[PDB]
Amino acid sequence: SMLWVGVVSIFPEMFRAISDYGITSRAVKQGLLTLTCWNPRVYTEDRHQTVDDRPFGGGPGMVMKIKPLEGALADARQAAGGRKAKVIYLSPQGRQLTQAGVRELAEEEALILIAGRYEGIDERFIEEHVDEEWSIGDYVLSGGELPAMVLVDAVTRLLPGALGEDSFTDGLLDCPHYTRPEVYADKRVPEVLLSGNHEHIRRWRLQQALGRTWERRADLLDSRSLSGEEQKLLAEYIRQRD
Amino acid sequence: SMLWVGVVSIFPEMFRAISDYGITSRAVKQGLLTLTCWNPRVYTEDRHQTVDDRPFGGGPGMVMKIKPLEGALADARQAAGGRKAKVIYLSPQGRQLTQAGVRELAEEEALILIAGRYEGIDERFIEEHVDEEWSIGDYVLSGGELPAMVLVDAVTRLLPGALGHADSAEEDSFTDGLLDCPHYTRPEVYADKRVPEVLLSGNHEHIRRWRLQQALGRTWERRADLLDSRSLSGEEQKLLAEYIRQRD
Ligand SMILES: Nc1ncnc2c1ncn2[C@@H]1O[C@H](C[C@@H](N)CC[C@H](N)C(=O)O)[C@@H](O)[C@H]1O
Ligand SMILES: Nc1ncnc2c1ncn2[C@@H]1O[C@H](C[C@@H](N)CC[C@H](N)C(=O)O)[C@@H](O)[C@H]1O
């Protein structure tokens, strides 16, 4: 009800990974998320339910047939009802998904996600019916199923009351985490977390985040508008390190 | 056999998405891929102890204990045999996954992936047992299961004979620092849009030049950042300069 998601995929059973597990499964139960699949294989003319077709110009692999995708997409737009649905094609050619992109995506009421397969889908189908293209990263997968689930998972986290700051909220990585025992195999939990002083635990965590962000991902800080307080904790972290 | 994968996750049965469907399922059946799961909840002190416990220092959430993770890792290591195993924690604080990262990981004999849940895993588990932290992108997911699946699918595509006649790893996006070209299939005309004439009647050299130009132009248009890293030849410069001028 909060967000309606329709997935066009030839492996709808893969979506059990999000329908049966975690925040996405909980969001469905809580009525915040509606999840549906539209299998191009159901929209075929032949006895073996063929969705691929050879490519023009030669080259290796196969390409997805326009008609079976169009078939599955038409029914999905119909099932969206009167919701303003954004048609996304999962692709390595798309806008790289980042937390800022996830927030944008979380404002939508309806999403139709097209999961490609093989060498990909016909460019004319993209030109005709695809509102936007999104990539989950600079690597190549065998289908759009895992990317579509990554996108759904990330967005659902921002759905009010689904969870029950993050690693990319305010261009800063996350702090380390400690739990029982107090000491495990001669390795002990930092004293600052054993003390009970909220301001001291916040100060340390915020420094440890700034510290890891500068160590591993200095690029996330160039974009960042670091405060006078954050500029002191990062400086302290840098100079007090071997 | 070619690659052995062990996943450490509180949701082992979530991995049916890769073990039962697509290329990863075919690779498992063809003997190219071994895929095993290892629930940390089976290695706790006693049945009354959960995988998680309260976080030291307060704050919202729970944190995965070290002993259950240590137990599943130890058992997963034993099962790998005499294969040299690389131990990966999926984390957004890790090394950003890229096609080149995928090529490196494809050369590994064994991988043990650690999918974390909750708020995070205890920092002392990482310090003592993790060989590398890998991120799938600059966004936060609820668990490491989808990132672990993304990694296995990407790597499996590069195993000899895993793609068949469906696709080719030699011709992808990011392999040579460029995005892929558009793809076209039957019919020659659809929605008052005709397949580019070069694909319908051109020779191999014309098709190659059009495919390279498209890959360059699409890279220039959507991902200019990729061109900053990867230099262009005289031919590529001329194919690109011409793409740019003929855009509309
Ligand atoms: N990194 C990714 N980001 C979003 N979707 C992806 C990504 N990798 C693969 N896909 C999906 O997987 C499908 C099949 C891919 N093997 C085709 C990729 C295409 N030949 C290319 O190199 O760009 C694509 O049609 C996409 O739907
Ligand atoms: N972008 C990602 N790339 C690789 N793994 C991820 C990514 N996002 C989340 N994870 C996994 O999801 C697990 C736990 C999540 N609740 C992440 C929230 C956690 N507080 C954090 O900011 O890292 C992490 O331990 C990782 O295993």
Side-chain angles (χ1 to χ4, degrees):
Chain A
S1 201
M2 185 115 64
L3 173 78
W4 179 103
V5 178
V7 184
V8 170
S9 158
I10 62 161
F11 294 113
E13 313 98 304
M14 279 182 75
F15 292 88
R16 284 179 198 140
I18 56 155
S19 72
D20 300 345
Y21 296 88
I23 195 175
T24 47
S25 196
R26 208 159 64 249
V28 169
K29 176 172 182 65
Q30 284 174 238
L32 328 148
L33 210 213
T34 297
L35 186 65
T36 52
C37 308
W38 307 90
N39 192 345
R41 292 220 210 94
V42 165
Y43 310 79
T44 61
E45 297 139 29
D46 62 287
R47 215 70 65 172
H48 296 84
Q49 302 178 300
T50 312
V51 282
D52 66 348
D53 213 332
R54 271 292 301 173
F56 284 124
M62 302 297 286
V63 179
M64 290 197 95
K65 275 179 76 188
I66 309 166
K67 191 75 166 187
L69 282 171
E70 250 171 35
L73 178 64
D75 274 14
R77 293 208 102 132
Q78 196 187 344
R83 292 170 180 267
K84 300 147 202 81
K86 186 168 257 201
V87 185
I88 290 160
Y89 170 54
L90 284 300
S91 173
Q93 269 66 263
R95 176 177 159 179
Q96 284 177 281
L97 187 67
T98 69
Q99 205 60 27
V102 171
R103 301 180 201 116
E104 269 171 62
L105 290 177
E107 286 153 15
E108 295 306 309
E109 72 187 282
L111 299 171
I112 303 175
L113 310 175
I114 294 149
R117 281 253 136 199
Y118 326 106
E119 271 316 279
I121 87 174
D122 192 284
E123 192 68 27
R124 300 160 298 169
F125 182 94
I126 297 157
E127 298 164 10
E128 261 303 296
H129 316 286
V130 168
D131 297 310
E132 42 183 57
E133 301 178 64
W134 285 84
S135 183
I136 63 156
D138 292 8
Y139 39 85
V140 167
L141 300 202
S142 69
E145 284 79 15
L146 296 167
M149 288 187 265
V150 164
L151 187 148
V152 169
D153 180 294
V155 166
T156 299
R157 282 189 74 265
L158 309 200
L159 295 182
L163 278 161
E165 276 165 68
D166 281 326
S167 297
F168 300 98
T169 307
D170 253 40
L172 237 94
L173 294 177
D174 197 36
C175 77
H177 302 290
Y178 300 90
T179 191
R180 284 90 157 128
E182 207 187 55
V183 194
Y184 188 103
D186 301 318
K187 300 173 87 98
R188 169 170 49 86
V189 170
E191 184 55 49
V192 208
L193 315 159
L194 304 174
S195 73
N197 188 313
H198 229 105
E199 256 294 324
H200 285 209
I201 303 155
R202 169 207 167 264
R203 184 219 139 257
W204 183 86
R205 282 177 176 161
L206 170 59
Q207 170 183 65
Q208 288 296 297
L210 285 153
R212 288 156 81 89
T213 317
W214 171 84
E215 280 199 73
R216 303 140 178 251
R217 290 295 305 272
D219 58 311
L220 299 179
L221 294 173
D222 292 346
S223 73
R224 236 272 203 191
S225 57
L226 11 77
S227 82
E229 194 240 356
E230 290 168 336
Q231 278 180 56
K232 285 203 163 188
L233 301 153
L234 180 59
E236 185 162 88
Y237 183 100
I238 297 167
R239 67 208 176 203
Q240 296 191 158
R241 194 175 67 96
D242 305 341
Chain B
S1 184
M2 184 122 279
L3 169 75
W4 189 95
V5 186
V7 191
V8 173
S9 173
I10 59 149
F11 301 142
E13 297 178 80
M14 206 199 282
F15 291 86
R16 261 181 206 127
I18 53 156
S19 60
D20 298 350
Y21 312 91
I23 62 129
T24 47
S25 200
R26 185 159 77 253
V28 162
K29 282 144 190 70
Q30 283 183 211
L32 293 156
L33 213 217
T34 298
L35 176 62
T36 61
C37 289
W38 313 78
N39 203 153
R41 87 167 181 87
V42 157
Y43 303 90
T44 42
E45 209 90 58
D46 56 60
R47 54 196 320 201
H48 302 152
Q49 308 280 286
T50 48
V51 283
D52 60 313
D53 210 313
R54 280 185 74 108
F56 274 127
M62 308 296 284
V63 172
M64 284 182 76
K65 285 143 79 273
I66 132 104
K67 201 124 210 164
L69 285 175
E70 208 178 73
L73 173 62
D75 203 354
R77 257 196 220 281
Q78 190 161 74
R83 282 169 186 274
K84 249 84 262 284
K86 199 155 238 79
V87 174
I88 296 139
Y89 176 43
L90 291 297
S91 166
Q93 271 87 271
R95 157 172 188 186
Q96 273 232 59
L97 185 69
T98 66
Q99 205 54 23
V102 176
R103 290 192 223 104
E104 291 173 27
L105 294 164
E107 280 163 23
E108 293 296 333
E109 245 166 24
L111 302 169
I112 296 162
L113 310 186
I114 286 136
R117 276 277 155 179
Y118 303 101
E119 249 257 273
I121 68 168
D122 188 272
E123 199 69 14
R124 304 170 280 176
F125 177 79
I126 313 181
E127 291 163 358
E128 218 86 293
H129 299 284
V130 173
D131 297 317
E132 34 212 56
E133 293 185 53
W134 285 86
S135 186
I136 59 156
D138 302 343
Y139 41 75
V140 195
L141 293 201
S142 75
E145 287 84 13
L146 294 169
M149 288 180 252
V150 158
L151 200 157
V152 172
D153 187 87
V155 168
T156 303
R157 277 191 77 258
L158 311 182
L159 302 181
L163 282 166
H165 88 290
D167 190 17
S168 179
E170 305 273 70
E171 267 80 59
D172 279 333
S173 329
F174 327 102
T175 61
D176 190 33
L178 298 174
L179 297 188
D180 195 9
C181 54
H183 298 283
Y184 293 97
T185 195
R186 274 82 183 177
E188 289 187 6
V189 184
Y190 205 97
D192 300 294
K193 306 162 160 291
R194 194 164 152 92
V195 162
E197 195 51 61
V198 61
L199 300 172
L200 293 186
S201 59
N203 70 277
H204 225 69
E205 180 53 24
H206 287 157
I207 297 159
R208 186 201 73 88
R209 273 179 73 81
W210 176 93
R211 283 189 180 150
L212 171 59
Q213 185 173 51
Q214 285 287 314
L216 290 152
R218 289 156 76 73
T219 308
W220 180 80
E221 289 199 280
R222 301 143 181 250
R223 291 294 305 279
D225 67 300
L226 292 189
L227 296 166
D228 288 12
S229 69
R230 180 243 202 245
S231 303
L232 306 180
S233 59
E235 181 205 23
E236 289 169 330
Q237 280 182 64
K238 289 166 185 167
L239 288 174
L240 180 53
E242 184 186 57
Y243 180 94
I244 288 174
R245 289 186 223 117
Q246 300 184 343
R247 238 181 306 168
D248 179 64

